[PDB]
């Protein structure tokens, strides 16, 4: 048998726990970490690879209960690309059978938690000490209880407390969240209100019902409908690429209230469609976008990082949540295998570190490069609209259409399995 503990009740941690409990030879316990809010950033979305992992983990019922997808006949459109100056059409990116899929983060976490069998969740207590020696991990909690397991999963988010345990154990330098220099205004607009605002400037009503991204120099604005198209979610990005490589105040949360004036002034000089959209946003907030560096390793002994704890990224490819789900599916398939025991666990974790980390780190890198492309800063594309529109239609396929089962087949071959 295998005793597995998971620290962190986010999407990645609860998803892994739900699948790991389906195996009779595995005993799982799920513990809470520090709650988050400012770390949500631009939000949560699901690409084609994410929904595939969700189905592979058996979480389709919870996903259908809460996820938001664009109404027919635009169900497969990921985004339409437009110039921020005049809202002219540049192209579109299509995700067949998925399109633009998003969720309120708390809605999906709550839906997943309700499906947990009794006795798996051990909430209401926090880990105060974590030690390991000879293939076993010991965790001491605030209530005096101690949990000892063969494997401890660090799924506690971008400010993971367990990441320091992993980086120190491997002798690597510590890693804290890095401010990207990009801030994002967030808000929601009633769809009928936005239609009347667009019509007043002669803007097509098509731009309300289909997800849109308005591209400009050092900034971009995205919209997509939620709640059966009755509400339009808006994220307006502003990037400071000046000399300093900027920082965020150490005593400042990553989110604050924003004034309408400062938001409209930040997009002064943008087109009529973009400014009319921003004027519709009530009570806007501003979010300081952070990510994590590419870690040299995710494993130290019997402690392993997944999700944002291992590979927190910028949201420009909508790939953050999906990479944590790919971590959960990859690990649960190997751990759930009959041939998995405590004797080959170190071998199993080495396959995870050799096959999951290089892909996740590449997604971290490409997410930053994609943001540079959105804001007309790519060193080759620049503002070439023909090349920009063509590359935007294709540059996401390696992420969306990756077959994770080929990585698992390579892991088993390295383990001499099946």
């Amino acid at each position: 048998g295998l005793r597995i503990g998971i620290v962190g009740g986010g999407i990645s941690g609860v998803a892994l726990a739900l699948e790991l409990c389906r195996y009779s030879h595995i005993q799982v316990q799920l513990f809470e970490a520090a709650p988050a809010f400012g770390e949500v950033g631009a939000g949560v979305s699901f690409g084609p690879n994410a929904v595939r992992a969700i189905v592979g983990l058996g979480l389709g019922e919870a996903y259908l209960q809460v996820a938001d997808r664009t109404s027919e006949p635009w169900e497969d459109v990921w985004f339409e690309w437009r110039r921020g100056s005049d809202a002219s059409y540049l192209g579109a990116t299509i995700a067949p059978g998925v399109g633009q899929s998003s969720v309120h983060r708390a809605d999906f976490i709550d839906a997943l938690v309700t499906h947990l069998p009794e006795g798996i969740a051990q909430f209401g207590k926090r880990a105060t000490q974590v030690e390991q020696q000879g293939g076993e991990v010991q965790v001491l909690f605030t209530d005096g209880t101690e949990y000892r397991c063969d494997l401890l999963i660090g799924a506690d988010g971008i400010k993971s407390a367990l990441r320091s345990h992993v980086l120190e154990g491997q002798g690597l330098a510590p890693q804290v969240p890095r401010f990207s220099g990009t801030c994002a205004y967030r808000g929601m607009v009633d769809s009928l209100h936005l239609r009347e605002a667009y019509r007043a400037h002669g803007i097509d009503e098509h731009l309300v019902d289909v997800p849109q991204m308005y591209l400009g120099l050092d900034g971009h604005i995205l919209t997509f409908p939620v709640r059966n198209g009755g509400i339009i979610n808006v994220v307006a990005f502003i990037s400071d690429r000046s000399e300093p490589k900027p920082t965020w105040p150490a005593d400042a949360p990553w989110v604050r209230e924003a004034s309408q004036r400062e938001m409209l002034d930040a997009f002064a000089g943008w087109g009529d469609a973009a400014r009319a959209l921003l004027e519709c946003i009530p009570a806007p907030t501003l979010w300081a976008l952070h990510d994590l560096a590419e870690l040299p390793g995710y494993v130290h002994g019997r402690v392993v990082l997944i999700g944002d704890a291992a590979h927190a990224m910028l949201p420009h490819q909508g790939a953050g949540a999906g990479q944590g789900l790919e971590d959960a599916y990859f690990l649960a398939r190997l751990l759930g295998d009959t041939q998995a025991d405590a004797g080959n666990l170190a071998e199993l974790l080495e396959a995870y570190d050799d096959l999951r980390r290089p892909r996740a780190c590449r997604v971290q890198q490409t997410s930053w490069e994609t943001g540079e492309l959105y804001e007309l800063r790519d060193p080759v594309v620049g503002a070439n609209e023909q090349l920009l529109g063509e590359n935007l239609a294709t540059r996401f396929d390696w992420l969306w259409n990756h077959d994770l089962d080929t990585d698992l087949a390579e892991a088993r071959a390295r383990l001499g399995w099946e």
Side-chain angles (χ1 to χ4, degrees):
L2 285 178
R3 304 164 298 162
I4 302 179
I6 305 167
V7 179
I11 296 179
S12 305
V14 180
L16 180 58
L18 278 164
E19 169 75 7
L20 281 185
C21 296
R22 308 189 207 276
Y23 298 95
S24 55
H25 69 285
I26 299 180
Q27 295 297 123
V28 196
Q29 290 196 7
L30 181 59
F31 309 109
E32 81 186 26
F37 180 75
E39 298 97 321
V40 171
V44 174
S45 59
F46 302 116
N49 61 304
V51 192
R52 188 156 59 253
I54 284 172
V55 172
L57 292 157
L59 316 174
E61 175 188 335
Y63 165 83
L64 292 184
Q65 178 65 36
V66 296
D68 281 305
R69 196 179 164 206
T70 312
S71 293
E72 160 265 291
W74 314 286
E75 67 282 341
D76 286 343
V77 177
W78 195 60
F79 276 115
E80 284 184 354
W81 312 104
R82 307 217 172 248
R83 296 212 295 254
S85 57
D86 58 5
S88 46
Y89 183 79
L90 298 179
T93 306
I94 310 300
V98 178
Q100 184 60 232
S101 182
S102 64
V103 74
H104 188 54
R105 178 184 184 259
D107 281 335
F108 193 44
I109 289 176
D110 170 79
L112 293 172
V113 166
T114 59
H115 289 102
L116 283 172
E118 311 256 63
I120 306 304
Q122 307 285 340
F123 300 153
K125 63 185 192 176
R126 195 71 40 91
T128 66
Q129 304 288 335
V130 173
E131 310 289 344
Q132 57 177 319
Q133 172 180 136
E136 200 185 52
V137 188
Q138 53 183 194
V139 182
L140 191 59
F141 293 90
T142 42
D143 64 349
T145 64
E146 177 187 3
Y147 179 71
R148 311 186 292 181
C149 53
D150 308 295
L151 176 69
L152 187 69
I153 312 280
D156 42 341
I158 184 173
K159 296 218 67 134
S160 160
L162 277 171
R163 178 170 63 245
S164 59
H165 179 92
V166 168
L167 294 178
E168 286 184 25
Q170 297 299 138
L172 292 163
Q175 296 293 340
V176 300
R178 333 123 95 207
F179 175 51
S180 67
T182 299
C183 292
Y185 298 91
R186 287 189 55 193
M188 299 174 124
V189 178
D190 170 78
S191 67
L192 182 56
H193 265 70
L194 184 58
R195 292 183 199 269
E196 301 172 342
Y198 277 179
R199 171 220 56 215
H201 299 75
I203 312 153
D204 195 331
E205 221 152 297
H206 181 82
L207 279 62
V208 177
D209 300 330
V210 185
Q212 307 291 326
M213 278 247 214
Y214 303 90
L215 308 182
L217 187 64
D218 293 331
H220 69 287
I221 303 167
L222 64 85
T223 68
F224 57 89
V226 298
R227 276 202 164 206
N228 295 8
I231 296 172
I232 307 299
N233 188 59
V234 183
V235 192
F237 301 80
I238 288 290
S239 295
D240 181 12
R241 294 185 169 86
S242 73
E243 194 158 22
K245 257 66 70 190
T247 54
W248 194 254
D251 62 341
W254 302 356
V255 59
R256 67 161 168 88
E257 281 193 0
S259 73
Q260 183 193 50
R261 183 207 59 81
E262 79 166 299
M263 180 178 66
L264 297 181
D265 291 9
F267 292 88
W270 282 65
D272 294 325
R275 297 189 52 79
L277 158 82
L278 299 175
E279 289 171 13
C280 294
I281 299 177
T285 56
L286 185 70
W287 299 70
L289 298 190
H290 291 64
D291 73 346
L292 188 69
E294 300 175 42
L295 306 187
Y298 293 171
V299 180
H300 165 54
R302 297 298 178 83
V303 181
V304 49
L305 307 171
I306 70 168
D308 277 4
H311 50 62
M313 65 189 66
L314 294 170
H316 306 310
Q317 292 183 145
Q323 287 305 297
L325 293 161
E326 285 187 2
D327 297 337
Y329 179 82
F330 185 92
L331 282 176
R333 277 307 196 264
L334 294 182
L335 293 164
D337 198 323
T338 47
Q339 308 170 272
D341 51 48
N344 56 32
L345 194 59
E347 233 180 323
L348 193 150
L349 301 180
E350 185 164 20
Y352 168 83
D353 198 60
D354 288 336
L355 295 169
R356 274 303 301 151
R357 174 178 50 83
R359 167 163 166 86
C361 288
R362 180 60 175 167
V363 180
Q364 284 180 288
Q365 173 68 29
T366 49
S367 293
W368 176 90
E369 301 174 341
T370 293
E372 303 286 300
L373 183 74
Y374 290 162
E375 306 184 342
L376 311 186
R377 290 300 192 184
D378 181 281
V380 176
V381 177
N384 190 307
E385 295 170 24
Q386 289 72 38
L387 191 51
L388 176 62
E390 214 279 318
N391 185 243
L392 285 164
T394 70
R395 69 180 287 107
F396 306 97
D397 286 348
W398 76 274
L399 172 77
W400 291 346
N401 305 329
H402 179 80
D403 194 338
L404 199 54
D405 286 335
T406 72
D407 293 328
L408 281 167
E410 170 62 25
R412 299 195 186 98
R414 295 180 175 202
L415 300 170
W417 268 21
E418 269 217 307

